[PDB]
Amino acid sequence: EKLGKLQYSLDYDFQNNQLLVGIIQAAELPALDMGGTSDPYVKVFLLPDKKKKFETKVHRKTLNPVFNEQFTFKVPYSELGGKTLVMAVYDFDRFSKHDIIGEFKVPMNTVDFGHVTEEWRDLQSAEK
Ligand SMILES: [Ca+2]
Ligand SMILES: [Ca+2]
Ligand SMILES: [Ca+2]
């Protein structure tokens, strides 16, 4: 199974003291519907609390979508280090329980916050 990835561009602005989470694009995702398609959308939040749980616009009928949506969490830097950033790209099924594509987590203590960390990180298979 070709499980795919999500590219992000994540920064912290120290004049306002806020987190910044630039969700760019996903590539090569599995089809979870009876026509070889997916309806992808990213659920974007922070551990362990879940302060501002976000949802991107749904890009219906594609396995390679482009979101371009920066999600801002207004949190101080001493509280940010312990918190771990989650992105879970989901298939929208309109009526039934929404079938997960996959997910990964990124600790803020591993991110060096000089400018912007911009990288492709891979989506691992979730059973949710
Ligand atoms: Ca589905
Ligand atoms: Ca669907
Ligand atoms: Ca379903």
Curated annotation (Swiss-Prot):
List every position bearing Phosphotyrosine. Answer: 90
UniProt-annotated binding residues for Ca(2+) 1:
33, 39, 91-93
Gene Ontology CC entries for this record: axon; chromaffin granule membrane; cytoplasm; dense core granule; excitatory synapse; exocytic vesicle; glutamatergic synapse; Golgi apparatus
Which residues are annotated as modified residue Phosphoserine in the UniProt record?
125
Give compartment(s).
Answer: Cytoplasmic vesicle, Secretory vesicle membrane; Cytoplasmic vesicle, Secretory vesicle, Synaptic vesicle membrane; Cytoplasmic vesicle, Secretory vesicle, Chromaffin granule membrane; Cytoplasm
Annotated residues that bind Ca(2+) 2 are located at: 32-33, 91, 93, 99
Tell me, what does this protein do in biology? Calcium sensor that participates in triggering neurotransmitter release at the synapse. May have a regulatory role in the membrane interactions during trafficking of synaptic vesicles at the active zone of the synapse. It binds acidic phospholipids with a specificity that requires the presence of both an acidic head group and a diacyl backbone. A Ca(2+)-dependent interaction between synaptotagmin and putative receptors for activated protein kinase C has also been reported. It can bind to at least three additional proteins in a Ca(2+)-independent manner; these are neurexins, syntaxin and AP2. (Microbial infection) Receptor for C.botulinum neurotoxin type B (BoNT/B, botB); interaction is improved in the presence of gangliosides. BoNT/B toxin binds to the membrane proximal vesicular domain of Syt1 (residues 32-51).
Please give the family membership noted in the entry.
Answer: Belongs to the synaptotagmin family.
Q: What is this protein called?
A: Synaptotagmin-1
Q: Which organism is it from?
A: Rattus norvegicus (Rat)
| Residue span relative to the full protein | 140 to 267 of 421
